[PDB]
């Protein structure tokens, strides 16, 4: 081996706002903005792998044309983004003179805005306020609560949502048509099921299954990627009889190499996000899980502790 090929997430990364199968409303909004111009300060929030960075990249590219190289300032979490950088480099870029069309503006893209320190975020306020006629700011984050309210007050808020089954299925069908891959309906269904609204993870699993077996079938997808972990944990907690839950925990989780910490933590998440049972029984189950979590953090993490946690949860559910 001498060199590798580009992954399908990067190779087929959308370069035009029409290729994005994300939230239709915000996509058409950004398309009309790039068509008319006058892009305002924006903050795009959501979950990983739904088309946030690609969306702002496509918007900046379409809005700047060939001037993207000298009119767009990209700053990721991999670069220093402290108070000194905001004071010197961002201010020098915002004060920089640049002849642009009468409908465009310089764009400052800040990826992972939820990781910037409080001082830099505070200094960015007047930085974006005094140069709001020749410099525009686009933040891309996962938690909008991590950005201070003064910064959110000077910008639009775009909350991206999970991708429905239809959109990811359409994108995967387009990728298969562009790549000439042998697939089947159940295989694509299993891929979308294991993706959980994550387009990047879906394309990655598809490419991995293709390069590992060639045929995208549910058997191959399940043998190369385990079932959604939270779902087996939910089925274990929602069991009606103790022996069924014990057998599930033994075979599916413990005999496959899942650590006790992952089991208990996944267990906590499943419960917190549960809606089948009432609030009080959910709180009691969370209490028992958290007592098991305590025991486990002290190094007493074994199968007996999880079995006792399940027994206590069933006793709580035993009226």
């Amino acid at each position: 081996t001498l060199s590798l090929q580009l992954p399908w997430v990067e190779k087929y990364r959308p370069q035009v706002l029409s290729d994005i199968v994300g939230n239709k409303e915000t996509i058409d909004r950004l398309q009309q903005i790039a068509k008319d111009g006058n892009m305002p300060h924006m903050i795009i929030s959501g979950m990983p792998g739904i088309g946030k960075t690609t969306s702002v990249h496509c918007l900046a590219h379409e809005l700047l044309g060939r001037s993207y190289a000298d009119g767009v300032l990209e700053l990721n979490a991999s670069d220093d983004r402290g108070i000194d950088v905001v004071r010197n480099q961002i201010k020098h870029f915002a004060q920089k003179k640049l002849h642009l069309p009468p409908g465009k503006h310089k764009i400052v893209i800040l990826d992972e805005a939820d990781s910037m320190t409080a001082g830099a975020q505070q200094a960015l306020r007047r930085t974006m306020e005094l140069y709001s006629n020749s410099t525009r700011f686009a933040f891309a984050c996962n938690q909008s609560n991590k950005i201070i309210e003064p910064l959110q007050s000077r910008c639009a808020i775009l909350r991206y949502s999970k991708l429905s089954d239809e959109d990811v299925l359409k994108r995967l069908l387009q990728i298969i048509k562009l790549e000439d891959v042998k697939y089947t309906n159940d295989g694509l269904e299993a891929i979308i099921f294991t993706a959980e609204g994550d387009m990047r993870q879906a394309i990655n699993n598809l490419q991995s299954t293709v390069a590992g077996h060639g045929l995208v079938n549910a058997d191959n997808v399940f043998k190369i990627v385990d079932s959604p972990h939270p779902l087996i944990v939910k089925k274990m907690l929602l069991a009606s009889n103790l022996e069924d839950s014990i057998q599930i925990l033994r075979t599916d989780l413990w005999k496959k190499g899942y650590s006790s910490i992952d089991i208990v933590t996944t267990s906590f998440r499943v419960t917190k996000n549960l809606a089948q049972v009432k609030e009080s029984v959910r709180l009691e189950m969370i209490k028992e899980i958290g007592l098991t979590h305590m025991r486990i953090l002290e190094g007493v993490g074994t199968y007996l502790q999880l079995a006792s946690m399940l027994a206590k949860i069933h006793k709580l559910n035993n009226k």
Binding site: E298, G299, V300, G301
Partner: protein
């Protein structure tokens, strides 16, 4: 030189005076010292993890092994001993331990290779690993995994659960067994004969019975009994009663009074007797242990009563093991077992 060491050992308490210097002095932990003696002729000493009750001889065993391996000359140059009295955070583990592991082994002298095997690796021991944080422990993983050719890691702890699973998997687990009367009577009799401790027939076996698998506490009790018998100068032999008096054991009659107050009596009488008993200083753990022995051993109670007494004593011991007030816990235990 050596004579000063002999005199300092002779003027030292019996715990440090009779510390095992060779791997043969270990009386009961034979399974571990057998492997340690076999690997002494070879050169494939693996990473080890000693765990067990306190006073079983882990530190003594590793010290004797390092001595028999390196000699009294290389004993101070090829050993990195880190105790709980030192800082063992992530910074220390990353800087000092890793710098010592990455360093090369010191050259042995001409007198070293003639009498000792002098293995091509050094030993880094970490005593009382229970106090080490899990992140500083995970930092040791690749440090001990990649530099195994030049250094060997020896962890020592009492609770094996306090050490993370990867570290427990990387090291060979050596469990030190409790030193009861059976496997420690020989060592106790040797210590008694070497000090001319004139005792009765069933004293030594009783001492270890009070020790509950702890040779250090047994040797301390033997030294105290010998001092108390030498001060009197009567020339008689030490009795089991004199030993259990200074060992913190409640007399049998005082325990029978507690059994009578529990069997027959109300809350007020039991509370008054507990308030009177707490005036005389007794450790609540010893009282709970004696009550457990009496209740489980006596063949005059129902099995349904025995399950409940066992669970109540277990709960009381678990509560006392957290630094609680002995009076409140003892009163609650006696009241709960009186309602049975």
């Amino acid at each position: 030189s050596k004579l000063a060491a002999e005199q300092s050992l002779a003027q030292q308490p019996w715990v440090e005076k009779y510390r095992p210097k060779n791997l043969d002095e270990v009386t009961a932990q034979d399974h571990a010292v057998t492997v340690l003696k076999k690997t002494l002729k070879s050169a494939n000493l693996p990473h080890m993890l000693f765990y067990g009750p306190p006073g079983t001889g882990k530190t003594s065993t590793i010290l004797a092994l390092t001595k028999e391996l390196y000699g009294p000359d290389l004993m101070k140059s090829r050993i990195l001993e880190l105790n709980a009295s030192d800082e063992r955070g992530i910074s220390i583990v990353r800087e000092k331990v890793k710098n010592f592991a990455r360093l090369t082994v010191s050259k042995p002298s001409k007198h070293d290779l003639e009498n000792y095997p002098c293995p091509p690796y050094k030993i880094i021991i970490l005593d009382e690993a229970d106090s080490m944080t899990a992140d500083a422990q995970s930092a040791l993983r690749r440090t001990m995994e990649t530099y195994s050719g030049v250094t060997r890691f020896c962890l020592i702890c009492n609770y094996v659960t306090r050490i993370i699973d990867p570290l427990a998997s990387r090291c060979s687990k050596f469990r030190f067994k409790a030193l009861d009367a059976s496997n420690a009577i020989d060592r106790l009799r040797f210590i008694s004969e070497q000090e001319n401790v004139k005792c009765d027939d069933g004293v030594l076996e009783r001492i270890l019975d009070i020790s509950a698998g702890d040779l250090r506490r047994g040797i301390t009790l033997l030294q105290s009994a010998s001092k108390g018998a030498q001060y009197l100068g009567d020339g008689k032999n030490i009795t089991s009663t004199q030993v259990e008096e200074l060992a913190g054991v409640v007399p049998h009659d005082i325990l029978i009074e507690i059994v009578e107050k529990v069997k027959s009596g109300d809350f007020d009488e039991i509370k008054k007797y507990v308030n009177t008993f707490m005036k005389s200083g007794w450790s609540a753990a010893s009282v709970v242990n004696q009550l457990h022995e009496y209740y489980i051993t006596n063949d005059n109670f129902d099995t349904n009563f025995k399950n409940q007494i066992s669970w109540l004593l277990f709960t009381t011991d678990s509560r006392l093991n957290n630094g609680t007030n002995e009076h409140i816990q003892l009163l609650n235990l006696l009241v709960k077992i009186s309602q049975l």
